[PDB]
Symmetry: C3
Subunit: 210 residues, 3 copies
């Protein structure tokens, strides 16, 4: 058949919970990664995450997330580089008798936590320990060095505030609704509402039901 069968969708992709093999990566349902233009699966988007240790920083990703091609998740902390020390060269991790009495410069940064309904643009890099709130949008080629508020749009290198998707009242409504945790039958009933800007109307409907 056509050469289109070789390609993958720009609007869709392989779900995360159908390709992740690293046990230190927690992913929610329906979250996918469309990485045709970088070959490797999502496991290789996560850099230097030890898959056999339980005392390392973890990568947690919510549900209904969209991750563009070539996204990078740094998961090794400072990688043994102490800027406050005299040298950033990791003497502790070079097998050399002259470096025997070096101190370990590795420092954890905490878990990298991606919320629900997060849109991560293509080739965006997420620094270790970064928390990204629900509904946030990471622009393409962004370098996220700080936390991102829920439903906040950020971009540039380093990532800085661009705008909020909705007003504070609407954001509060979505955070209380938490449609990502609704039963599958509720999403099927509210597909037309979820594909619109009418947050206040859906919030009033959700109040009567629950």
């Amino acid at each position: 058949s056509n050469a289109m069968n070789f390609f993958t969708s720009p609007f869709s992709g392989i779900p995360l919970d159908q390709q992740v093999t690293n046990p230190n990566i927690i992913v929610g349902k329906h979250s996918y990664y469309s990485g045709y233009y970088h070959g490797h699966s999502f496991d290789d988007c996560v850099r230097y995450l030890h898959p056999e240790r339980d005392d390392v920083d973890k990568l947690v990703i919510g549900s209904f997330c969209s991750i563009g091609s070539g996204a990078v998740f740094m998961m090794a902390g400072n990688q043994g580089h102490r800027s406050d020390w005299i040298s950033t060269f990791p003497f502790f991790y070079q097998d050399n008798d002259n470096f025997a009495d070096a101190r370990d410069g590795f420092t954890r940064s905490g878990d990298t936590i991606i919320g629900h309904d997060v849109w991560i643009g293509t080739e965006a890099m997420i620094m270790p320990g970064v928390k990204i709130g629900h509904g946030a949008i990471i622009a393409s080629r962004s370098v996220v060095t700080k936390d991102v508020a829920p439903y906040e749009v950020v971009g540039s290198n380093p990532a800085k505030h661009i705008k909020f998707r909705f007003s504070d009242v609407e954001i509060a409504m979505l955070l209380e609704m938490a449609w990502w945790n609704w039963p599958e039958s509720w999403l099927k009933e509210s597909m037309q509402s979820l594909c619109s800007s009418d947050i206040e109307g859906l919030y009033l409907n959700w109040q009567s039901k629950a």
Copy 2:
């Protein structure tokens, strides 16, 4: 012979009209792409451009263009992500019975139009629908999210104004001359002038001939 035969030139490269296979990519003569450090041809620099549909955004590139290695041309619009909607997750493009009544969130951005004599730095990303005027210079690692004026130099992420190559009078002279549309014999006669900053002198010469 030497290992240099395996390499490709940093000053030159394979012309675009000698390697482009996607019919939705319009390229001018002499425009080339030097992509040794990214392997793939120029067709893979253009991301998610359907090669079998005539109702999609097209990529138009002028003549005498220089495109560095790893340049990216996003050609899929918003890829079904509506930031103004409640969720950016493209329910319409996931085959799931619970998403049957979703609305299509895809929105075209218009054709990406690259003018004549455009220098695109290596690993620069061009967002969908961006128009770049004649003679503009795209710095390396740029993320061009807005239109670029003729003979404007832009850089950074997102791309912002750096400078104009020449004065407004000189730019007007070059836009009226349009040497990229001259016969091949006129360029051969004016090779020494085209390789200099003497725009006003060449404009006076072109007035007497035409």
Copy 3:
């Protein structure tokens, strides 16, 4: 054995003087490159550096340097593109009878010099002719278009000043000490001091010995 044997360390890597084949690349001892997530060795991090000519810009890298994965070193000057000329299209490097009388637009930028104890973040791009002082830190995804002072931290695209690692007195102490040139026995004795922020204490100790 384990799948960990296939991987390489994020804290360490193959030393530069154990993998560099290009004779126009001068590297110091202990400097390494950890490029697991980009496949190629350090020779392919250096772009368009002619390995058989002695009249080109050279890449000089000091000792005890840490280079992240995917770092890029542009080593071809302007690549024949003269922005001050009428056209940036390199007519001189296209074999065409109509371009026979073109002038050479190539211009060298000088040697790219990386000092000692320089930490270069992953996927950072170094423009041609850039000098980076001792102890500087190049943040990830940086585009270094200008010189970097010793022990200066820079980031963003284009790279701009973030901070200095230490005070002017401490920087002067480290530049006079130059521990990267100490005998191997001196580093083994001062491993605990090099893995700390006590620059002034080590400077007082070094004064008594030398």
